[PDB]
Amino acid sequence: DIPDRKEAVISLWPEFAKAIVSGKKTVEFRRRIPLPALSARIWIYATRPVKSVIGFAYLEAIVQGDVNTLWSRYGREAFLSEQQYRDYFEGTEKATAFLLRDHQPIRPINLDQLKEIRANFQPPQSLTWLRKEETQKLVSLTS
Ligand SMILES: [Cl-]
Ligand SMILES: [Cl-]
């Protein structure tokens, strides 16, 4: 029984995780990774020291294309220096741009609660898809 990928979790360092949930960062760049559904809700897991899901946002678009064109068009909305961007994309010619909308902060759901939802949860290297019963438990914890 395969997840539909309309619900996914992504990991960011806490300054960037907070920028997405506050609506300051509306673009997240990644390499060519397996993609979520276009209508997905993306729950934002902040890594140490926060180690918590701190909110979510939705996708208005997924863009893939040349690394230079993605920087020129969307880099201003991504909250990262051009240097951090060039360093992350060294070694590939193409990138993914996740364009986000409708960000929502929540009271943080810590890693102990997350392991109560999925026993071996650990922060994803890219995306992880939530199963429907996992999603029902996470929505139940939201404030
Ligand atoms: Cl990667
Ligand atoms: Cl670890």
Numbering used by the authors: 3 to 145
The study reports:
In the ethanologenic bacterium Zymomonas mobilis ZM4, the gene ZMO0922 encodes a 148 amino acid polypeptide, which has been annotated as a putative ASCH domain-containing protein (ZmASCH) that belongs to family 23. Here, we report the three-dimensional crystal structure of ZmASCH which confirms the fold of a central β-barrel core and reveals a positively-charged cleft with a pocket on the surface. In vitro assays showed that ZmASCH bound nucleic acids and possessed cleavage activity specifically towards single-stranded RNAs. The weak nuclease activity of ZmASCH depended on magnesium ions and the protein appeared to prefer the consecutive pyrimidine-adenine dinucleotides for its cleavage activity.
